[PDB]
Design a protein around this motif. Structure first.
Motif, PDB file in Angstrom:
ATOM      1  N   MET E  63       0.858  -1.241   0.023  1.00  9.89           N
ATOM      2  CA  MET E  63      -0.040  -0.046  -0.022  1.00  9.89           C
ATOM      3  C   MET E  63       0.976   0.969   0.127  1.00  9.89           C
ATOM      4  O   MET E  63       0.444   2.387  -0.891  1.00  9.89           O
ATOM      5  CB  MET E  63      -1.112  -0.129   1.167  1.00  9.89           C
ATOM      6  N   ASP E  64       2.066   1.267   0.616  1.00 10.61           N
ATOM      7  CA  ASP E  64       2.697   2.327   1.191  1.00 10.61           C
ATOM      8  C   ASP E  64       4.389   2.146   0.474  1.00 10.61           C
ATOM      9  O   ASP E  64       4.766   1.045   0.935  1.00 10.61           O
ATOM     10  CB  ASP E  64       2.767   3.177   2.396  1.00 10.61           C
ATOM     11  N   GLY E  65       4.696   3.048  -0.260  1.00  8.72           N
ATOM     12  CA  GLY E  65       6.395   2.886  -0.635  1.00  8.72           C
ATOM     13  C   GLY E  65       6.350   3.634  -1.882  1.00  8.72           C
ATOM     14  O   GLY E  65       5.467   4.442  -2.271  1.00  8.72           O
ATOM     15  N   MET E  66       7.529   3.284  -2.585  1.00  5.76           N
ATOM     16  CA  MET E  66       7.878   4.075  -4.012  1.00  5.76           C
ATOM     17  C   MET E  66       6.766   3.895  -4.919  1.00  5.76           C
ATOM     18  O   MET E  66       6.623   2.433  -5.236  1.00  5.76           O
ATOM     19  CB  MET E  66       9.149   3.601  -4.107  1.00  5.76           C
ATOM     20  N   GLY E  92      -2.863   7.495   4.225  1.00  7.41           N
ATOM     21  CA  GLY E  92      -2.148   7.263   2.939  1.00  7.41           C
ATOM     22  C   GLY E  92      -2.246   5.426   2.723  1.00  7.41           C
ATOM     23  O   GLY E  92      -2.375   5.003   1.476  1.00  7.41           O
ATOM     24  N   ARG E  93      -2.561   4.873   3.862  1.00  3.51           N
ATOM     25  CA  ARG E  93      -3.029   3.266   3.772  1.00  3.51           C
ATOM     26  C   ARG E  93      -4.414   3.106   3.980  1.00  3.51           C
ATOM     27  O   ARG E  93      -5.261   2.554   3.215  1.00  3.51           O
ATOM     28  CB  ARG E  93      -2.117   2.738   4.849  1.00  3.51           C
ATOM     29  N   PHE E  94      -4.939   3.580   5.221  1.00  3.16           N
ATOM     30  CA  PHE E  94      -6.162   3.666   5.371  1.00  3.16           C
ATOM     31  C   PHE E  94      -6.735   4.883   6.083  1.00  3.16           C
ATOM     32  O   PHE E  94      -6.933   5.114   7.309  1.00  3.16           O
ATOM     33  CB  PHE E  94      -6.761   2.290   6.493  1.00  3.16           C
TER      34      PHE E  94
HETATM   35 MG   LIG Z   1       5.752   5.356   3.155  1.00  9.74          MG
END
Ligand SMILES: [Mg+2]
Ligand SMILES: [Mg+2]
Ligand SMILES: [Mg+2]
Ligand SMILES: [Mg+2]
Ligand SMILES: [Mg+2]
Lengths: 22, 542, 489, 139, 139, 124, 137, 136
Positions: E63-66, E92-94
């Motif tokens: 979900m989160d990252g590059m 950003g995720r939930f």
């Molecule tokens: Mg991140």
């Protein structure tokens, strides 16, 4: 040709608990 | 065959087993009993398994076939079974040969907790091949496993690998034989006494003697390299090497070296004498033990007020007794996972065995075998299991391989009554608060290496301190040393400042009597009267 | 030039001599060992905490000895095809023996020898058995020596430690003050220093750093100098002027700053949060302040006199008194001013729900404390973790009893007991076990009483040292008026 | 990525790590960012899985060893650093640890300006009051 | 599904999540519904099992990252919102945690109407009474 | 069965349960009898094992889904059952199978191919 | 026997069990001997495999799938009385166990074994059968 | 002996279950006083555990009919502190009162595997020691 495999499944634990005595 | 030593009975049995079916099988047919084909070897690592097998192979001269345990597998599809089959086929077809499988556990894990279909296949193929034992082949199998329990029990079935030989730890005579065998190629000095070195190599087993020899040679070679044909390892060199080394099995549990002499433990003279007699007589007068016919006690429990010196006596025993010593801390045995605790206790007691003599010092026994009163309340639910394992492993030790476990607790009231029963840990030594003479002895033993002024009368200090424990005496001495050090530092600082603008080399050469007088203003009894009463009550009750 | 010679290693002269002997003498002077008669050992195991120089020792041996050298990384042996790892090990050992008399170096063997009894992998148990067989067996070795390096020797398989397979186990442990000086001189022979630099003071003031820690100190000092002089000079990507680029020099202030920032890597997990207190910040308590200061500074600064008298120093101390008198304040002052490392642990912090993990935590804390010694360990509210034994009818498997027993054994047992200072601070010592209060564990019981008039004035002056005040205002009346107050009041 | 390297075959996770580092070193002076290392480094002492111990040892050796690194800087990110093997928290492996913590008022104002530079805004809105009234926001 | 992803093998469950997300993203701008995340996310602090921690880390990295997400939305469902890793509940995720709780009596009437419309019933039954009567019965 | 399907391998008991549900839905409208659900329903809050919470979520996924198939359960203590399990669509009807006339009926049906007052404590 | 039920083919153990049971039901009213049941029944709680669970379920449904017209019984020997499935010890399959805790059989075994050697002329095997107490087989 | 009612009770319960399982049997209760302690009144946790133990023992001994033919043997040094509720008729009514010849037999059984001096008699030790015991 055959091959092997690596797998780690689980273990067991033994918790502790504190009680109340009247 | 002569090279292997210290295993007279086992070597004779193996020689008979390997020679009779290989030298003259006419007498075997005449009697009618067919000697077995598979032969297992069991015992601690380095006991001499591989050496004995190579010596039998050379002394007999029969054709040989080595099967390296982990070397039976292959990369291509289905070649391990063919490899083993062709190995056995060549071993039979060539001659009445001998096949030796090294590290059998690597190939025959088990038929239960064994995954890896390929592995199971190989195991079954080996079981079948050993099943097809035809005496006309005149080929015997020699197995050598250092882990005799974790073997596939199917291989133990009749018709394949039926005769076991527990090649155990060598005894005093075996150790002397091994020492003589190993020391023959080396140019030993005249003064060396191999009989003494073997009587002193108490817990050493097999390879450890070789390690001792190699270390002695290395030490001598360095001793004379730093300073040609004038080269010889002396008795002092061998003694140094033996002191440096420790028994191979107990390498992991090797405690750090803390020095303590039997004269360092002031007071407790009769108790120390009784402990020395109890630990040394069962190990030194076997003829007396045999003539008496009475089993010596295999345990002892020290009890008393805190600081009386229980750990000091344990350290003195570990240092001065001529046997191995494994220290254990109470909670150290406990582990989070399920089973690990009892497995660790079993491993510790197994390590204590197989290296007799041994001395397992269980410090703070109120953590391992505490009185498990509370049972209705649910908690870890394993303390009972640990206590039961300790009871079974303290009551189950065989008379042979004497291993005396010394217990040490500060509050014996929490020690379960079970462990304090005959057979498991019988003797109960009570270390009382020191009297005036004991206090003087302790102070003189603690101030042995401390330079002191000529006119110090420690007897006055002892006569004054009446209810003071050994720890209190240690505190008094340390306070006196600290005050003297502070005075010396101040004097040295003043002298350095003056020279920067004068005491001797030592401004305070000796701890001043006034220094001790001021140090003793802040001393008090460590153990109170309630604790003294409770310990005296327990002593008189028991 | 970058090749590390045998002189690069420092602080481990004894182990260096042992390894040099084992590696060279059977090759430089084989005649001596044929004359004595027996063969020399052909196996060595280096063990110790990380960042001590074992891999450096391997590099040094590889650079110095002219014999063949073969390298085996730990997990590198493993492979996917069934029964192929053993083939790789066989190939390595055969190449080593075949080519020349050689030295194999097997890094991180801990991961490859899981003791063969707690492990459950098939490929792993075959790799362990193949190693054992290659190392020892029919035609075991021929003029080949094996060096291994590990961080947890107790994990290695017992069969591998016996004589014939690994004859000598050398302990590459923490260096001493002289070791730190040698390491510093080794690491600062290439970087250009300002002449004011004094390495002896730095080695004395470093208390637990091992190898790479000192290297980090040096690197950080250099970087501080670079960020001290890269400010006056602009970015200037094209070029940096010769006048600045040369004549840089590393002042002692940079080294002091880097020492004030860095802490030993072992203690990196338990590094205390930064706090700004000083001794003059503590009003009153002059005699207790000086007694504590001398009792901490004497064993660490004046060891020769203690060894001259041949007696060990006092270690423990217990503050006790009414709440709000300055116990934690004194602990903070010691943490910030005294040179020894500080591990601040709260009372009930270390307990855990599982079975035995409280005592495991205690053992780990004390192992770290004696590892990066000298250290001071602050036990706040000792009556929480050190209670009387047998008090409670209902308990969680006697966890408190096992905790206090573990504390007793760790503070006084079968250990080296070199230099760890335990400081306890509890305002109700009645719950403390007498064993804990016994001398040899916590021998100095210091009572911190309520301040009197002059101590209240001293405290007020200490607490108003950073506040602007009316010049006409005096505090003597306030002190004369408070007669039962505390520092908190 | 953190758990991206693990595979079922025995001896393949370490092969993946070796391939990654070899690719990083063979090309140019590179930078390696490893996100969520708390899943790869389970301290190698509290864990019981052999593959985890082997992966941790492989990473430790590839990071430090003979001819360890040639002009490659390694960056790592974690949400809990205390659950990592101490052997990785040493100079040479992870030289320096930066603590990216809770911003202050000025930081929050900077973040607000950064995030409100492409969106349209009215003239009645001031960011200083927003950054003042915003207290525990992590950015 | 919640438990369908995870497997006994080493590094296979993480492969399941990677396969799912990659197939969705390659397919089209899409919605991904995950049920019973509390079985997948035990907070990485009370979860002894290492496969659980690897699964949580892989999910977080997905979900989160590059370049983590592009035109794909995610929806989650858990009976126990608290039993979930705090790193997931971050923006950003939930981003938004919506509670689908018990409806009001009017909601009960709506539910009754929706159920009733397809089936056939007598004319005497009136829904308003029954809806008013049933206060706590949900859905 | 309850303790039969449970194992220590991760994701194997759920795979077996999914295989059983696929076999029950593949051939025909059938009847599934899952016995002893209280061992694999620890209410997701009192347990410590991850596999038990995982298999309750597996039952909730496979049960709620169904194409003309009814499931039956069995337990001794119904209080250790997840509320989601005891919901409509999964276990919407609860049957209490707990006397002298029933014991006589059991004696009559047990003595068909081949006493009611004295065997007062016989379960059946 | 116990561990003689595994074959190269996957699941062939169930086919072998079904073949043996259908052969014993097909031929005659007979008796089946299952030696070393501790390998087939791993007590179902300490095991972790899946073909062992499958072969235990096959043995359970084959012991349960015996009707009245089969008229076959089964005999099974074991070493430890604790590593057995309670589902195998349930009512229906195994309920009548014997506890074999003699001198005539020992003399018979002696006269069977030692009669193929040039033994002696002054031996009395009755004394060896009397003095031997706990030996078996 | 455990904390109180429950674990200790279950211990005595499954001891009597093993007794009724291995019929006929003899349950040798050593040191009966330590178990019974004449429950009476103690008013504490130890008193409650003693009362629960005594009630479990009475309700698991009085339920023994002519079937299963178990037999409980008790032994003590102090008969004062035994419970009169356990010395009642119908549960345990016999009272065997318990020398020189037994002391000589004990010394001869203890000195079986011992190389004794031939010129030695133990009748002097038997006559000198009157109120001693086998442990001493
Ligand atoms: Mg991140
Ligand atoms: Mg060998
Ligand atoms: Mg002590
Ligand atoms: Mg290194
Ligand atoms: Mg405070």
């Amino acid at each position: 040709a055959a091959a092997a495999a690596a797998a780690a499944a689980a273990a067991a634990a033994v918790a502790v608990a504190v009680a109340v005595a009247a | 065959y002569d090279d292997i030593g210290g295993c007279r009975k086992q070597m004779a049995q193996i020689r008979e087993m390997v020679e009779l079916p290989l030298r003259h099988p006419q007498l075997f047919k005449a009697i009618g009993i067919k000697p077995p084909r598979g032969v297992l070897m069991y015992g601690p690592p380095g006991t001499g398994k591989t050496l004995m097998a190579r010596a039998v192979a050379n002394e007999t001269g029969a054709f040989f076939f080595l099967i390296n345990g982990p070397e039976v597998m292959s990369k291509m599809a289905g070649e391990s079974e063919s490899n083993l089959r062709k190995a056995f086929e060549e071993a039979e077809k060539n001659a009445p040969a001998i096949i030796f499988i090294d590290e059998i556990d690597s190939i025959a894990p088990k038929r239960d907790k064994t995954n890896g279909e390929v592995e199971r296949r190989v195991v079954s193929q080996l079981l079948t091949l050993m099943d097809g034992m035809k005496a006309r082949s005149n080929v015997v199998v020699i197995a050598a496993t250092n882990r005799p329990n974790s073997i596939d029990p199917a291989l133990r079935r009749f018709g394949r690998f039926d005769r076991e030989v527990d090649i155990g730890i060598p005894d005093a005579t075996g150790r002397l034989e091994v020492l003589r065998i190993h020391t023959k190629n080396m140019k030993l000095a005249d003064d060396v006494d191999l009989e003494a070195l073997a009587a002193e190599t108490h817990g050493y087993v097999g390879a450890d003697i070789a390690s001792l020899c190699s270390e002695a040679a290395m030490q001598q070679i360095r001793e004379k390299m730093d300073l040609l044909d004038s080269l010889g390892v002396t008795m002092d060199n061998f003694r140094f090497a033996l002191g440096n080394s420790n028994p191979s099995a107990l390498r992991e549990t090797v405690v750090e070296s803390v020095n303590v002499t039997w004269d360092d433990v002031g007071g407790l003279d009769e108790i120390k004498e009784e402990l020395k007699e109890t630990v040394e007589y069962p190990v030194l007068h076997p003829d007396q033990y045999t003539k008496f016919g009475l089993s010596p006690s295999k345990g002892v429990l020290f009890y008393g007020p805190p600081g009386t010196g229980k750990t000091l006596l344990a350290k003195a025993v570990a240092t001065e007794v001529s046997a191995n010593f494994i220290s254990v801390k109470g909670p150290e045995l406990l582990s989070m996972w399920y089973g690990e605790s009892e497995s660790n206790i079993r491993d510790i007691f197994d390590k204590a065995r197989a290296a007799a003599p041994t001395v397992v010092f269980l410090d703070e026994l109120d953590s391992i075998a505490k009185a498990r009163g509370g049972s209705l309340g649910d908690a870890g639910g394993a303390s009972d299991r640990v206590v039961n394992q300790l009871l079974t492993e303290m009551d189950g030790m065989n008379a042979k391989k004497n291993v005396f476990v010394i217990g040490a607790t500060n509050r014996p009231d929490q020690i379960d009554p079970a462990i304090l029963r005959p057979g498991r840990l019988d003797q109960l030594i009570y270390v009382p608060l020191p009297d005036e003479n004991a206090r003087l002895s302790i102070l003189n033993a603690q101030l042995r290496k401390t330079p002191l002024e000529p006119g110090l009368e420690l007897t006055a200090i002892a006569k004054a301190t009446q209810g003071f424990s050994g720890a209190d005496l240690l505190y008094i001495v340390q306070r006196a040393a600290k005050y003297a050090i502070k005075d010396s530092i101040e004097a040295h600082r003043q002298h350095e400042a003056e020279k920067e603008v004068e005491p001797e080399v030592d401004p305070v050469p000796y701890i001043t009597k006034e220094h001790f007088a001021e140090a003793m203003k802040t001393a008090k009894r460590s153990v109170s009267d309630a604790e003294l009463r409770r310990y005296e009550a327990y002593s008189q009750q028991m | 030039m970058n090749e590390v010679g045998y002189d690069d290693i420092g602080g481990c002269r004894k182990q260096m001599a042992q390894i040099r002997e084992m590696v060279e003498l059977p090759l430089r002077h084989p005649q001596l060992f044929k004359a004595i008669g027996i063969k020399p050992p052909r196996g060595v195991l280096m063990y110790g905490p990380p960042g001590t120089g074992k891999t450096l020792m391997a590099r040094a041996v590889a650079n110095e000895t002219g014999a063949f050298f073969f390298l085996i990384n730990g997990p590198e042996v493993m492979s996917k095809m069934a029964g192929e790892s053993e083939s790789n090990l066989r190939k390595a050992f055969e190449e080593a023996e075949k080519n020349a008399p050689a030295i194999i170096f097997i890094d991180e063997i801990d991961s490859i020898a899981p003791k063969r009894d707690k492990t459950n992998g098939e490929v792993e148990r075959r790799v362990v058995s193949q190693l054992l067989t290659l190392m020892d067996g029919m035609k075991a070795r021929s003029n080949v020596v094996v060096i291994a390096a590990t961080n947890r020797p107790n994990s290695i398989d017992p069969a591998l430690r016996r004589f014939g397979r690994f004859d000598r186990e050398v302990d590459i442990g923490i260096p001493d003050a002289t070791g730190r000086l040698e390491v510093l001189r080794i690491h600062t022979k290439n970087m250009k220093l300002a002449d004011d630099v004094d390495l002896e003071a730095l080695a004395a003031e470093t208390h637990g750093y091992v190898g790479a820690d000192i290297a980090s100190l040096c690197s950080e000092a250099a970087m501080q100098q670079i960020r001290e002089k890269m400010d006056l000079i602009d970015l200037d990507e094209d070029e940096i002027d010769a006048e600045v680029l040369d004549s840089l020099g590393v002042t002692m202030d940079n080294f002091r700053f880097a020492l004030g920032n860095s802490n030993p890597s072992a203690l990196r997990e338990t590094v205390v949060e930064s706090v700004n207190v000083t001794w003059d910040d503590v009003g009153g308590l002059d005699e207790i302040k000086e007694e504590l200061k001398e009792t901490v500074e004497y064993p660490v600064l004046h060891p020769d006199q203690y060894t001259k008298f041949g007696l060990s120093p006092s270690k423990g101390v217990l503050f006790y008194g009414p709440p709000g008198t300055g116990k934690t304040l004194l602990a903070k002052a010691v943490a910030t001013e005294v040179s020894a490392n500080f591990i601040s642990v709260k009372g009930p912090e270390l307990l855990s729900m599982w079975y035995g993990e409280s005592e495991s935590n205690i053992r780990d804390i004390f192992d770290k404390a004696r590892a990066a010694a000298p250290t001071v360990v602050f036990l706040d509210e000792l009556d929480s973790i050190a209670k009387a034994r047998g008090g409670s009818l209902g308990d969680a498997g006697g966890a408190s009893d096992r905790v206090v027993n573990q504390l007793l054994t760790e503070m006084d047992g079968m250990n080296a007991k070199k230099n760890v200072f335990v400081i306890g601070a509890t305002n109700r010592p009645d719950q403390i076990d007498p064993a804990i209060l016994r001398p040899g564990r916590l021998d100095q019981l210091i009572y911190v009483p309520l301040p009197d008039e002059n101590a209240r004035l001293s405290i007020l002056n200490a607490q108003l040292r950073k506040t602007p005040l009316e010049p006409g205002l005096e505090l003597t009346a306030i002190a004369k008026a408070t007669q039962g107050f505390s520092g908190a009041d």
